[PDB]
Symmetry: D3
Subunit: 272 residues, 6 copies
């Protein structure tokens, strides 16, 4: 909990995030994947370059969010979805618009919760999409009532075994769990300074790919897909590294992705 | 002669050389005892109006997946050593060497397949790099952490997952890479469907669930880097083979099980942590 | 579930004479096999018209014999105790159990047909208020924690995951309670499942486990075996006799042969809920 | 080891209730018996040679269980090797050899018992097949999977179950057979009753629960083939011994604990998978 | 429910040993453990006095209340709103001290209906019966709700149950971040196996002593991370040697003293956090 | 291994360390415990006296560690996982007169250790060598006692304890002084993460230490929190000029209890 408060007294308090959500209305708090489109990007000497760069970055960010939903498997309007650490509800809205089902979000930031519902009412879907302040480790959802859940870059803030144990609980048998995250590669040995820098920067705790796989195995979660998206997210960062929205953590990511001490992966497992 | 089962599973491959695996291995010289992946080039194939071209197409797909497997062995130099658990006739071994120019140690229960492999190995003039030998993949002679990469290309249904991965984990160097292409019944389905059981009775093997594969690896310091379902890629191969005359009579079991999702063809590449 | 949905359809139909014509002479319809020597006396000679009629009786006797043998390992059980039958079939064992202990006997099966058949026959005996079968997955039963005095799996554990099934029994089973199971498992001493075993799996569309899995699964679920006996020699007679009858289903060989070379074995395990 | 040290003390030190029985067959056993008592040929207290007949009866029952144990070692030829963890004076070892004519390696902590065993072994002219040696059953010199069958006849209460079974599992050949006759407190009872604790304090040992035995075996690739409770078979032995004059003063603890079911005498025969 | 406990309950439903009651009278606090800390021989003047034995009982009781106090020192911060649990509370000696020191709720649990009533009886006298309460119940299956207990402990009562099951329970009703403490005697795994001395103690109290190894592993398997692990053998030795010369002797003094000497048995204290 | 190269580099490549080693002759790469000799310290050559005080505290904890190695004769062998420059190794030998095998990833530290070892004329008893503490050459159960003095944050707990448990004799003694984030706090606080990024290491939770030992036949005999004892050391070092810039992270984390300095001595069961 003492750490939980650290996270709450954090997210309840950037440009590189809001200005992008300002274009679509979809506010994301994760990273992008995909080939940069230097077509619509234009050159650095145009009256509205930075404006086009923000659009490109946001596109990539919405791109991975969409990519995540592709692994939630078949899901009808009667099913319920859970978003552990939903942020401002960006992914939640997309999910609903795409499946027209119930989407329950959960976050530690009362600010993010309200922001999500606020934006939810505007779209007139507040009765299907709802964010609430709650710890993803102890959620109110009943056993096996959720068709699919996921963690889009929010698993570095909690204990893997405990979090997957929860998902496994409220997740229906045969249900689908997905997660996009950054984990230090066990093949490298131990967390490199780069990774530690990212932890100190976001005040989180990155896990190894080994922990992710073992944690899932110990919680009746059998991976159906395990793909390394590092090559897909590299473009996003290198582009963001040249912008002015830079937060100062770009190097840590780019470098760690380069030497392979850190990796961006996606895992979709079944609730067996 | 480890166990009574491995006596039958050994006598099997020692006394069984079907046309569907030889006639194909003939076109190249590389003999394969597994299945293929990828789309079918019907253009260059033509219609049944041919059989010689069909064998080439089937063989292409089979060599295609073998190549696909090697793509997941990661970087490997001429100084590294590779192990092939249940190498069969050495098809994959030859390709591996030609592609990396390193040592390739194969291991099989069939003395026939072993000799066949080395025989063909001498012809290519690589017998001093590529070598097959009669031995149980569960108790191999390779020393601890001396192997750069190993794999199981459709041969893990003949042994206990924990024991086999435990062995690989042993002789495999820290940071090494392990890969495996296999067919496992989907735990999402519940239990092995009749189709799967039919395949077991046909090949006298024991197919595992995707759950066992993942847990077994986790219990043996094997962290999966890639886990892809190749069912959609292998379907074409079977449907085509189903129309040929090389048919062995197990085509239906595969096609059907792949269809209803009770059985799946997957590829897993994990690191030796 | 997709798999279980398959076993439901399988049994909803069935109607094998080798199974009904035997439970007719008693009302105790069993869907398992039998142990014990053969009473060739009451058997007689094949050159008789009522021979087949006597063969069915003999086979049924052996089948009811093992069912009785199973109950012998449930330990002391009074009229106030509750018993569970994972995969009860038509209720053959359930009726015997009640008649023998006069207690509650809750059965559970995937076949709605078998369920109704069981209750139907249950009302005839006038015990429907003590013996009841219901359509439900033995892996997720409605019985409350530690309220069951004893439960068992009479040839039905090949249709589910051992850890999950024993975990359930361990749940609703009272501390100190007794669990029993009669099943066929491939002997790990042999190495791997022989073709014979695989043939049996494909035939019944099931999934036989190794004796190793049974023991480990129980150990991981607070189930300590009190008795572990190999009944292969006791069930052999049953099969060899059935192999000569006309009720033959075509899987007789697989069993006989696998039992012979020791790749497959018929065992009974009775463990305590620690 | 400090424990083993003083467990060796005990053993380097001759109960009449032990030697006097073994002096009738040359079969020096150090355990208890099973089987119903033959009152007829036993005798009536109203006679002189009664006690002499009682010793014979008790010894018979003790050799009876030893024989019963060997019945669970499965097939074993003259070429096979057997191990006796905590062999005592070699009683069971001699019987084993005479019955299978194979190598029988014994191991004990008591140098006295070792020499006694070999001494008696030379007399029978089998010292080149049957041999006892001072060594800890937890760290034996036998090579991996070279033993056809091993066992613990009332000697597992002196060591850690996981470690001891781990050892047996090591030197035991795959498919080999392990057997053990012992007394363990029934987990069904809850915890060790005073009776059991009294037995521990008496023999300076550490009785385990039936739960530990089963779990320990499962964790060491030992799958039980047979698990039978011999309490009813050993009761007669004790009740008879309770009336004799060889009484050591621990008879009650056993009889009572067997009665209330807090303690049980069981036999377990498992395969080395 | 269960043969064994069925006994333990019967066992304690008799008790009445003077080496317990005469020592609990001097103060009003009725303990059922042993003491720690050096002995004040000076306070035990002219052995040839009608008051020596009276002073010896006071000294022994002091040492016994001393360790009880020492245990509470490891319960960490605890306010009047928190709830504490005493697995195998005995007559409530430690419970009363705990409350007087923290003024919070103290739930005790024992198998002896006699000890339970005695505890509440004495609890009403102090006028704290609405905060301190003992009840007949198995510490392995307690009625307390999940994570509602701020701190719990086992003061020499863990030898009567299965470590994994008991710690699993504590871990259940114990709040996340909560504190668990336990003072007990366990045979040192460094010695090998339970020496006769230990077995004698088991047969004497009809219990089942565990190894320090089981304690540590059992806790690790139940989300209980030890913050402190101290061997109090040297601190409890004085208590026994003194008690060995008294007339309250129960006949188990030697087993303890000797086992503590050769190191086959040890008196330890463990304070872990509920992670 | 790739990570090992990083750490190797780190060490092959400070004054606050060697300066203090100049006085006694012992070179420690850890920290100190115990109260400060506030009086006899100062308020001209103040800095010279401050270095002596800091070094005293550092040698103090090193000594404190050896106190938990239990009885050890001249015939016994000791292992120092991540020995650094051999400071603790020398003290150990001078105190027990036995064999002291050290192991480090830095060839520089290894040679420095042996160099200094020859000067004291004990090179035939005390020896440092370049090797990974996870895969040491020592034979099974031949070591009487081993330890990790602030070096366990550079390796996997299960693997490292598994090794110690291997070469360590049954009944042997293992000790370790380290900093671990308190699981009671929840997760690693920024302070801890800052320390990781600073030393390029990976701090573990007290939970991992205890579980890892339990899984490797290592039963803790003593578990004491030395945070209050090491606080003085840091606050004093925070005012000196040897400051490396990581002082705050430590002091603060120790304060809010998100990070703790503990000592664990377990037996090889
Ligand atoms: N323990 C926790 N319980 C619930 N939510 C948390 C917890 N820790 C962090 N979070 C939230 O997880 C989210 C992580 C963010 N990167 C947002 C992820 C979100 N999927 C998005 O795409 O925006 C933030 O809202 C954090 O506040
Ligand atoms: N237990 C075993 N140990 C070693 N080899 C085995 C074992 N079981 C089966 N095999 C061999 O593994 C191979 C399985 C075949 N499907 C061939 C696979 C081979 N990788 C190929 O693609 O040609 C055959 O050579 C089997 O004889
Ligand atoms: N998952 C399941 N849940 C409930 N019942 C099942 C399940 N799987 C199989 N069964 C039933 O288990 C029974 C197995 C049969 N051999 C009957 C066993 C029964 N004890 C008897 O001897 O009559 C059948 O009724 C199956 O339908
Ligand atoms: N750690 C040990 N290693 C080897 N033997 C032991 C050990 N501890 C006890 N023993 C022996 O275990 C034996 C137990 C006796 N009851 C003899 C058993 C023997 N199987 C018999 O049938 O007589 C004694 O000879 C002990 O010396
Ligand atoms: N299974 C059990 N469940 C609950 N309490 C038990 C159980 N077994 C023993 N006890 C209690 O353990 C207690 C141990 C006694 N030494 C009292 C300890 C108590 N902390 C005291 O200081 O008095 C006894 O009061 C027993 O009643
Ligand atoms: N894999 C490794 N094998 C051996 N040593 C290592 C390894 N990783 C890190 N280290 C050592 O970790 C040590 C950390 C130092 N603080 C040790 C100081 C030492 N305990 C002393 O007080 O002198 C460095 O000296 C490294 O040499
Ligand atoms: C997909 C699965 C589960 C494969 C198991 C391994 C196996 C029996 C290979 C045989 O291939 P083959 O090429 O030697 O024989 P076939 O003639 O059938 O191609
Ligand atoms: C140990 C093994 C292999 C058990 C098989 C369990 C099973 C499916 C029994 C059905 O018997 P049944 O009596 O209903 O059908 P049949 O009489 O035709 O065999
Ligand atoms: C748990 C069990 C059965 C322990 C028995 C230990 C034992 C055999 C002790 C002495 O040998 P002995 O039994 O030959 O001597 P005695 O018959 O005089 O007790
Ligand atoms: C240290 C160990 C193993 C204790 C277990 C036995 C126990 C609960 C003693 C305390 O009770 P008590 O104080 O009433 O007993 P006694 O009358 O001997 O003081
Ligand atoms: C969690 C903790 C405390 C880990 C220890 C990290 C470490 C190597 C400290 C000593 O460094 P050093 O002595 O080489 O340099 P410094 O002068 O900073 O102590
Ligand atoms: C993948 C990892 C380790 C994430 C940890 C940080 C986090 C939860 C979000 C970062 O994106 P953001 O949009 O919320 O913040 P920013 O884009 O400003 O970095
Ligand atoms: Mg962003
Ligand atoms: Mg082929
Ligand atoms: Mg039938
Ligand atoms: Mg005797
Ligand atoms: Mg007392
Ligand atoms: Mg320093």
């Amino acid at each position: 909990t003492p750490y939980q408060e650290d996270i709450a007294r954090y997210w309840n308090n950037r440009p590189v995030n809001l200005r992008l959500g300002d274009v679509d209305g979809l506010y994301h708090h994760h990273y992008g994947i995909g080939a940069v489109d230097h077509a619509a990007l234009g050159d650095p000497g145009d009256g509205g370059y930075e404006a086009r760069l923000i659009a490109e970055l946001h596109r990539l960010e919405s791109a991975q969010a969409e990519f995540l939903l592709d692994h939630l498997g078949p899901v009808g309007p009667g099913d319920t979805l859970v978003d552990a650490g939903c942020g401002r509800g960006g992914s939640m809205v997309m999910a609903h618009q795409r499946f027209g089902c119930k989407v329950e979000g959960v976050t530690l930031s009362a600010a993010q919760a309200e922001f999500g519902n606020r934006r939810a009412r505007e779209l007139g879907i507040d009765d299907h999409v709802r964010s609430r302040v709650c710890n993803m480790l102890d959620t109110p959802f009943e056993k096996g009532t959720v068709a699919a859940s996921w963690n889009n870059e929010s698993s570095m803030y909690v204990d893997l075994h405990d979090v997957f144990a929860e998902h496994s609980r409220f997740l229906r048998v045969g249900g689908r769990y997905v997660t996009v995250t950054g984990c230090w590669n066990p093949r490298y040995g131990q967390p490199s300074k780069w990774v530690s820098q990212i932890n100190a920067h976001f005040e989180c705790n990155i896990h190894s790919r080994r922990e992710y796989l073992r944690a899932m195995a110990d919680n009746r979660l059998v991976p159906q897909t395990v793909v390394d998206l590092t090559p897909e997210t590299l473009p996003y960062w290198e582009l963001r590294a040249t912008s002015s929205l830079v937060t100062g953590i770009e190097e840590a990511f780019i470098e760690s992705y380069r030497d392979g001490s850190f990796q961006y992966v996606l895992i979709a497992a079944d609730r067996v």
